[PDB]
Design a protein that fits this description.
It is classed as oxidoreductase. Four copies of one chain form a homotetramer. Chain A is α+β, with helices and mostly antiparallel strands. Chain A is built from six helices and twelve strands. Chain A has a single domain, classed as Roll (Urate Oxidase), CATH 3.10.270.10. Helices cover 25% and strands 40% of the residues of chain A. The interface between C and D is large, with 57 and 57 residues. The complex binds 8-nitro-3,7-dihydro-1H-purine-2,6-dione (4 copies) and sodium ion (4 copies). One sodium ion binds next to strand 3 of chain D.
Amino acid sequence: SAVKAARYGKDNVRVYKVHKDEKTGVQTVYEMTVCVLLEGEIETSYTKADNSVIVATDSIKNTIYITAKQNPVTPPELFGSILGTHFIEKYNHIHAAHVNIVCHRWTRMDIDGKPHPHSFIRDSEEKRNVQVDVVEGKGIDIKSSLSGLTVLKSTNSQFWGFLRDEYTTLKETWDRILSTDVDATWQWKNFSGLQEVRSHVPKFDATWATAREVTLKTFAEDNSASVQATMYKMAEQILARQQLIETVEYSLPNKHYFEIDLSWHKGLQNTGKNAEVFAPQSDPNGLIKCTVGRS
Amino acid sequence: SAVKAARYGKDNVRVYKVHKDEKTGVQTVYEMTVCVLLEGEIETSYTKADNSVIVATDSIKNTIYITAKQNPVTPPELFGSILGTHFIEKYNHIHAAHVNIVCHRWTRMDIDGKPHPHSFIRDSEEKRNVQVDVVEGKGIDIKSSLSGLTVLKSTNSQFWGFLRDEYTTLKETWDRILSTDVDATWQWKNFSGLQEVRSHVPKFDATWATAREVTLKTFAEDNSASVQATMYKMAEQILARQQLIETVEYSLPNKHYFEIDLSWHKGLQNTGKNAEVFAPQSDPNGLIKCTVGRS
Amino acid sequence: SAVKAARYGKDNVRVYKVHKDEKTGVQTVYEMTVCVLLEGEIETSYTKADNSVIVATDSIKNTIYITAKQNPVTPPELFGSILGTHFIEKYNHIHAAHVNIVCHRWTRMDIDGKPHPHSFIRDSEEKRNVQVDVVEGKGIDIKSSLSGLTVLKSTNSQFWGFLRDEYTTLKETWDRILSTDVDATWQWKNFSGLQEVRSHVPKFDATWATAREVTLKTFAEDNSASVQATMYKMAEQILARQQLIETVEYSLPNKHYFEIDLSWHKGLQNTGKNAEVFAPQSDPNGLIKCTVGRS
Amino acid sequence: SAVKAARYGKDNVRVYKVHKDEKTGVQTVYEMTVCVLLEGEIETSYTKADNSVIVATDSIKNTIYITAKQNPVTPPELFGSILGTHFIEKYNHIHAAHVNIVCHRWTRMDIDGKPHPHSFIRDSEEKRNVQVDVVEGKGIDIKSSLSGLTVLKSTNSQFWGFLRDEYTTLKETWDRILSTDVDATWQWKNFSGLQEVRSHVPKFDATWATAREVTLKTFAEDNSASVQATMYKMAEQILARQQLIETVEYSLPNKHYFEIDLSWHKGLQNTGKNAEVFAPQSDPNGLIKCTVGRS
Ligand SMILES: O=c1[nH]c(=O)c2[nH]c([N+](=O)[O-])nc2[nH]1
Ligand SMILES: O=c1[nH]c(=O)c2[nH]c([N+](=O)[O-])nc2[nH]1
Ligand SMILES: O=c1[nH]c(=O)c2[nH]c([N+](=O)[O-])nc2[nH]1
Ligand SMILES: O=c1[nH]c(=O)c2[nH]c([N+](=O)[O-])nc2[nH]1
Ligand code: NA
Ligand code: NA
Ligand code: NA
Ligand code: NA
């Protein structure tokens, strides 16, 4: 036998950081969950019980905290790049570092209509994420995403004209509910190293904002022919607004809301134009995926 | 043997309802999860296999949908009361109906700064809930609550002066992080029936708003001596602002954020005044509860 | 305002303990999650910022570990009683201790048909739990339970003869699937203190075994008229086999498995006697509860 | 813009099937969760609102049920292959079908020491899974796995000899707890189509059994130098016992159990040889991965 691939490290490392402005007394918080997995000349830890090649996962944890103490943790694309670069530079025999970061929302509270200097609310489980792969000799590959953005529109969604055969029971519709949990990923041009990442730092928050904005406005305004057709419109716009992105990927569940026929009870009319009460379906769910690039 | 208590029904019933304004084309959505459990002269279904006394749980489900079709689903205190009253009035041998409702957030989107007529976002897993107990002969008992309201303040929390003995290791602190998930319940005066609930309908949305407002402002502004002391201030204010509430109950976890001593590494200073990076602790957690009534 | 009720403490305390037999080298492990909440003369911590009355939740945590070091952690009824008694005896102003314990399964592995001396498997998320309320002046109240015991029978379940009216659509059936997650609780006679708990120690493991045994055999063998009728048979038998239990409570979801009519496709017959493929329903679910005492 | 990749279908489809032996009255149940995602000449559904190319996800659902009615659902490698083959053969423009199956445990109960003909228990959340990729022109690629197999050993685990530098605080140990959730995957030789899968049907249950057996025995018996070294031994043995597997992949968290120093309390000795009570850590966790192939 032989090792064909191997990576190891520390997962589920929770990290908080606070910034305190001395002049103003305004505090800002950041919270994330970090995973760092390393690759390199480590195969003998598996095949020969040779632990000398192992940077202990506890030491990886410590390094995450130390790196957060010594550097900005925002934007997460930057933090991830600093962190991954550290491992491949510090350790001769480590040749790749795979950094995943989940950013949690802590939005400043407004109290009596004024922003509070040190109080925050979790306004949803929507996450902002990065996957940063720092590979010796091959730069830094970054995938940025937003996830857990849960939306619903109550009309201006359709689904008709699909293939019909002996497996088909679904009725065509010209007016349905559409709800989803948005998972959207933009894949950056390869960066040659940490300096090139640094050179683009403002583009990370701006592109996340654009992606979110485009997603919400297109979802709200598209008189949707399908999840397929709507998500493609989102991706095309994001590509048109950031040249340093190569692809945009969406993964969208169709979280079904079924009509409830109540005509068996006192002739109640609750279908078609009279539909008011629906049964949200937990499972199953359609799942629609696309990766969009430039022509 | 003998039945000492029994209740049965349908849990986890997901319900959506849409309202469409003909004049304006503005749509409004509501979504909930409903549980209805019945009590009455039903013991023989347990002891003698006598199903004649059972209103099938599937029929309870149907009734939930029908009731939602024929009535407003908001405020949930009202809907719950209508629903519970139905069962004790329709069925001679059913003498109590226990209705729990979880309301899910669907907040109207603002697109390009204008509210959208039919598009919504789940801005957090914060819930608004009711527990409505409709008991034949004894009116309607309602507990209203908000839950899953997750907050953090980065300073203006203290904890010192606690009991110290041979079990104590915790250091006193004059400046710590405080984070919690707020579960707040206001218990209404008993209502004599559905008419009295109806008579108070505007008070339900107003009292939920007050409770939320008081919670957030007191959390943000209190230079907190303890979770105990802060939650009591919240409860006292809510009681002072709605005479028809008898008690306010809080259940608050203390979601700990631990300092990380990094002085072992290059003499890094990350404790006390220099504390910037912290380790959020998933477990264990303090749990602090209070029920506050009037003097 | 005034405090009407208050309790506070530490939740979600994970605890492992190992026993090592010197003679034999056989190791045995125990793992639990513990919550301890205290009541007493603590109201001034809420109303007057007086922390002097607070046994810190961190100290409660420490005490859990210390108590586990100095005492058997099994049966959990005993451990819980020792732990709760400690708090009301150690602290004059603490008058009740509420101890909840969740026991996790670590079943010894059999390797090559022989039990292994120090290797274990989690054979399900079924839990064994206790709720121990130690109240100064009023002894020790214990509720023991098993939960998360998930079972299915593929026939010998019926449901017919239920009430039929204008809300009813459910078809009567003489042969259906029955599946549930068993939550069964036996409530002990009040104990006057820790000595009386000690005096009954063998009865705790024996009664848990009986409850589990009765549950499984009655579920498997009862040609069930309803969940109501089957759960009552379980409760009656457990009461008949342990005189020191006062009541047995069951809480059982009916986790529905729906037939799928496929006759629209090539006349496939998949209903009634020909039913082979079913759709398990995640929600909604019937919920059936009973508390059984002695006549 | 242009579509670079696209797949769509139905996720989270719950499926039960029962087999009834007429001769004997012995019933056997199977339960799974299925996802089917299709690829093909479908890009115009995204770019041009052309739904004519869409096999509706509801029809995919129906097809899953129909296929389960007409074929064995075990072993899941076979069922998955039948299902995926159907889609690429039935639809000219569909060129790949990606089938994921999660199999849930329903183990026959033994009652009074005899196996019951129609009653079952969920003995853990351990799953048996397949990923079956049926690609037109390129056969059938199958990855089989077991997951959620949670184990603990209380001794005969070590971790010393790892790299030590200025980021390192972890103490070397010669006797620690090791616990993990086993995720093990065996990747089959490419199959040319459904006939070749059929030809190997007995090997699927046998290889799953071997993988489970090897995993448990090696975990229990290895005086472990590291998770790395132990998991490699498991993989090598599985490869040696099934020539039709090309690689074995493990993904193992190190679910840490920390010592608790209690010497601050009455000089209690709970570390090293005296360690009895430990704190299980929910997060963070080491994460160790390997893909092993043949030399
Ligand atoms: O937008 C949609 N795309 C699909 O591919 C689809 N398939 C189904 N369906 O049959 O339920 N609804 C759908 N809605
Ligand atoms: O506000 C608090 N109340 C408490 O009762 C408490 N106990 C502990 N503690 O020891 O960690 N922190 C606490 N903080
Ligand atoms: O055992 C049962 N008890 C019930 O009370 C019940 N109600 C319904 N039902 O209508 O679905 N099934 C049921 N099955
Ligand atoms: O088996 C192990 N492998 C590792 O790579 C490792 N790293 C750490 N650690 O530092 O905690 N424990 C570990 N245990
Ligand atoms: Na390197
Ligand atoms: Na009645
Ligand atoms: Na006391
Ligand atoms: Na094809």
